[PDB]
Design a protein around this nucleic acid. Structure first.
Lengths: 66, 97, 134, 137, 183, 136, 61
RNA sequence: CUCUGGCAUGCUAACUAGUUACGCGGCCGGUCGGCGUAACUUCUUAGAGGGACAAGUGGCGUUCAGCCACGCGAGACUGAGCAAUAACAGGUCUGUGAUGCCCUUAGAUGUCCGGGGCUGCACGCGCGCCACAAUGGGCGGAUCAACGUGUCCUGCGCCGACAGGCGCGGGUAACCCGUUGAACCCCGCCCGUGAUGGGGACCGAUUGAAACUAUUUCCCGAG
């Protein structure tokens, strides 16, 4: 469900700029599947562009670059 | 040692022959263990009241109390035969071992 | 030289044994801060952050719980570690502080020191539960 | 095995039994559905090592179990679709093939009582993993 | 010793409303670490108002049959709900929660007799605003990728300034316009 | 990205590539959740990918095992055509014989005038279900 | 028109067909005037506060 | 009034119930387990006897009957049972060696044989099961009940994937099942603008003498 590079480069710059970084809110702004919006968002956590503040069994919330 | 159990249906007659047994045994200077209070067992039988299919689903709750009391006694059996014949009352069952 | 005070929820009876050590709070051998209901984590740490960290550093209590359910055992633990602690302050220490700990627990939560008389009443025929009637 | 996270302990203990490839690991039982009340096979590839670590964990807590009561530990709620869901035992052969595997590792002993307490070596390896997971946090 | 929830407190963010001060339990007298106490609040008449507002929302969210008798499932919902609104809005979640509940309590409602609408009890407001805000997050996220905890945070940000988009805000103005019709 | 397959035509049936592997092959009749995961567990195929994520080699390797499961260390009690009355050969019908194999056995019951075959011809409950209130 | 606030001073009794309404007299706090009675719905006791949107009518029963 | 339940660290007793004290079992004496008869009973059981009566304060009241709010407190307290003068043409002749009468009474208005009687074009009740995954299904953890029954309940060892099967054992029971490892729930991962991993409709074993009109159970398919 990974869209073209135009959506990927925007995710590398815009979704870290979001205040509430969540696989549910990014799916509404970029049309990403519920899995890839959560799976591909883990790479940004490994790069340090986002911070994982809560990772529950059925709840995942990330914060801005701070 | 002899362990005599007391299984009865009424508690008033159970503790009476139980107290009358230990008093008749302690007077002979015998080592009697305390009366162990076995957990009582109630016999629940939920039977429909009406002998037909007419009613408001009214049930009848029956019960039956079963009390057991353990009494141990380390003494010769010749001194306990007459003691078991003085605390016999209807309603309580005596089991000498 | 020890007091065993029980905490009774619906059916969970938690008896706490009180001894003195250096920062050891465990229940059924397992540590108190690592019980399965991670949601009810502060409920077990409830008599810790309002009673005094320095007043809770030299106390070692090991609880043994049985009966009830998951949440009922949680409230049985905090009922055991709280009452068994006050019983130590009143039997081995003075009452000047035994009433100090008593007042801070009551002003926050009464059920932290008084068990609830609420139990599951008997079911009646004609309905699914006690009062409902299908 | 206590004093640490019981979920992270079995996650670490399963990796210990994976490195030491000395378990039984049957040919067909390792690719079938685990329990009757289950819907599909375990999604984890090394599921047999996770339950193995969980089996020694319960024997460390409760002894004299045997394969008859082990399936009760891993029991769950069976989905009957239209009938009310009930409880059922997990599996007898999975518990049997996982118990005999640990006896090969000299971790569990046999007894007429059934599945007696862990061997001194079985208890030994459990605390060692319990110390590693504590140091990791 | 401020008796926080572990993450948030209620200092310098006190209630700006001067009507519901008694039936909004925020201060240290009712503050708690976790909104879960089971202290027999539904026994007397007004003893339910003594319950903190965070715990009442937890008891009000567990509804719709399936999630009834599941409080641990609901505590984590409102727990994450306060963290998400604290991220969407830099303000404290308890400050906006008070702002979300004061802007959702029906001021006037029609009492069908026989029709008449005069006023609403202050406890009836908090009893309903909590029910409005809880049902505001239930129906708004049913067939949605947004979880219930995320949907609860949206109920607070829109109710702070009165964005009229929350399901609770769309019911307060409805109860006020119908109340004016029968008056 | 590249190498991604939108549709995977397997057994002359369109299989979506947007979803995962072990649940997109389930669109084929005859293979469900249990059989799809086993044939992907025997073969060295990672299940944590999308259907279009695979290549032309893995897709061909799947159908080789599904057509002959017993030849890949798969037991007999796992198939949907165990101990056929006609030939007695265990096989796995996949959306092409399942429409016919599960059709000729019903006709087998009608040709012998069996009660189980008559109710299918009439269109009623055959397994003792009380059609007095259901089957409407 | 400016909004006025008032504190519940005394509960009179239950009104309405189903008895859900509670006739309660109120009194303004800022300006001492218009100690008029109003009709309230729900649990009402002595000491409550009613944000009266108007100050014109009594609306008895 | 009676049996229940809420407390009584006060009493009477417990190897058919247990904890608690230090010693042989591993780890880092601490920290956790298993195995043996020393003290007594918090925890368990059941006996006796207490405790709670609108008793205390405030308010409202023929300042009576009481009622309301506060304290103190295990509760300001609840759930059963037995239940009147009677009535109904409301059910029971198919609950009886309860019964009157009548019909049927040896080609029988007692049985019984494999059994037939588990039956549908739509309307009706009550009830289980999710839907309208998103608070759910899944998978793997992890972790807590209670009444009641047991000559049948079931414990261990071989072996099926599941359902089963075989030998060896305990228990007529606070003794064995049994510390009744119950589910929901808790935690990790997977799924995701979708009739989807939602929904589970409809299409080999066991019980017995015997399951066809699937008794149930399981497997795969089935949607």
């Amino acid at each position: 469900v990974l869209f073209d590079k135009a959506t990927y480069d925007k995710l590398y710059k815009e979704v870290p700029n979001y205040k509430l970084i969540t696989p549910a809110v990014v799916s509404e702004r970029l049309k990403i599947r519920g899995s890839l919006a959560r799976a591909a968002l883990q790479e940004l956590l490994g790069k340090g562009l986002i911070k994982l503040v809560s990772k529950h069994r059925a709840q995942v919330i990330y914060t801005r670059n701070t | 040692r002899i362990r005599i159990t007391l299984t009865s249906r009424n508690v008033k007659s159970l503790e009476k022959v139980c107290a009358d047994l230990i008093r008749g045994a302690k007077e002979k200077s015998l080592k009697v263990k305390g009366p162990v209070r076995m957990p009582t067992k109630t016999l629940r039988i939920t039977t429909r009241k009406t002998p037909c299919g007419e009613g408001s689903k009214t049930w009848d709750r029956f019960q039956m109390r079963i009390h057991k009391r353990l009494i141990d006694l380390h003494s010769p059996s010749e001194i306990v035969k007459q003691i078991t014949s003085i605390s016999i009352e209807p309603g309580v069952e005596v089991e000498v071992t | 030289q020890s007091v065993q005070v029980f905490g009774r929820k619906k059916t969970a009876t938690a008896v706490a044994h009180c001894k003195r050590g250096n920062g050891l709070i465990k229940v059924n051998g397992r540590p108190l801060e690592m019980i399965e209901p991670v949601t009810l984590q502060y409920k077990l740490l409830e008599p810790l952050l309002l009673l005094g960290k320095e007043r809770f550093a030299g106390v070692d209590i090991r609880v043994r719980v049985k009966g009830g359910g998951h949440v009922a055992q949680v409230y049985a633990i905090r009922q055991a570690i709280s009452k068994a602690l006050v019983a130590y302050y009143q039997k081995y220490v003075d009452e000047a502080s035994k009433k100090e700990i008593k007042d801070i627990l009551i002003q926050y939560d009464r059920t932290l020191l008084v068990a609830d008389p609420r139990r599951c009443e008997s079911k009646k025929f004609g309905g699914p539960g006690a009062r409902a009637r299908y | 095995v206590k004093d640490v996270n019981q979920q992270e302990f079995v996650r670490a203990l399963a990796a210990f039994l994976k490195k030491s490839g000395k378990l039984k690991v049957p040919d067909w039982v390792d690719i079938v559905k685990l329990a009757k009340h289950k819907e599909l096979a375990p999604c984890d590839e090394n599921w047999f090592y996770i339950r193995a670590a969980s089996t020694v964990r319960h024997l460390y807590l409760r002894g004299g179990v045997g394969v008859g009561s082990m399936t009760k530990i891993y029991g769950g709620r069976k989905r009957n679709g239209v009938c009310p869901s009930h409880f059922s035992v997990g599996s007898k052969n999975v518990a049997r093939k996982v118990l005999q595997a640990l006896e090969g590792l000299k971790m569990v002993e046999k007894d007429p009582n059934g599945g007696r307490r862990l061997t001194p070596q079985g208890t030994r390896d459990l605390d060692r993993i319990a110390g590693q997971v504590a140091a990791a946090s | 010793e401020i008796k926080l929830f572990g993450k948030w407190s209620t200092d310098d963010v006190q209630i700006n409303d001067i009507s519901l001060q008694d039936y909004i339990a925020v201060k240290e007298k009712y503050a708690k670490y976790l909104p879960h106490s089971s202290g027999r609040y539904a026994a007397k008449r007004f003893r339910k108002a003594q319950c903190p507002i965070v715990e009442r929302v937890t008891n009000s969210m567990m509804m719709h049959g399936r999630n009834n008798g599941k409080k641990l499932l609901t505590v984590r919902i409102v727990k994450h709900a306060f963290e998400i609104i604290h991220l969407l809005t830099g303000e404290n979640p308890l400050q906006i929660l008070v702002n979300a509940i004061i802007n959702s309590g029906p001021r006037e409602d029609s009492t069908r007799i026989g029709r008449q609408a005069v006023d609403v009890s202050p406890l009836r407001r908090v009893n309903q605003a909590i029910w409005l805000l809880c049902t505001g997050a239930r129906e708004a996220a049913f067939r949605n990728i947004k979880t219930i905890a995320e949907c609860l945070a949206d109920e607070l940000i829109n109710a702070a300034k009165g964005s009229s988009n929350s399901y609770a805000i769309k019911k307060k103005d409805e109860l006020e316009r119908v109340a004016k019709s029968n008056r | 990205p590249e190498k991604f397959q939108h549709i995977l035509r397997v057994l002359n049936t369109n299989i979506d590539g947007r979803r995962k592997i072990a649940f997109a092959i389930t669109a084929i009749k005859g293979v469900g959740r249990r059989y799809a995961h086993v044939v992907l567990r025997k073969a060295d195929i990672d299940l944590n990918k999308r259907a279009g994520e695979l290549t032309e080699d893995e897709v061909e390797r799947v159908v080789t095992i599904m057509q002959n499961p017993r030849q890949y260390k798969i037991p007999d009690w796992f198939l949907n055509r165990q101990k056929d009355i006609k030939d007695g050969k265990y096989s796995q019908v996949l959306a092409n014989g399942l429409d016919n194999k599960l059709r000729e056995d019903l006709e087998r019951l009608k040709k012998i005038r069996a009660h189980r075959g008559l109710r299918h011809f009439w269109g009623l409950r055959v397994r003792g279900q009380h059609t007095k209130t259901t089957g409407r | 028109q400016p909004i006025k606030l008032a504190r519940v001073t005394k509960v009179l009794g239950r009104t309405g067909s189903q008895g859900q309404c509670t006739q309660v007299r109120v009194e303004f706090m800022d300006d001492s005037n218009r100690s008029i009675i109003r009709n309230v719905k729900g649990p009402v006791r002595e000491g409550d506060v009613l944000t009266l949107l108007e100050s014109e009518r009594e609306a008895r029963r």
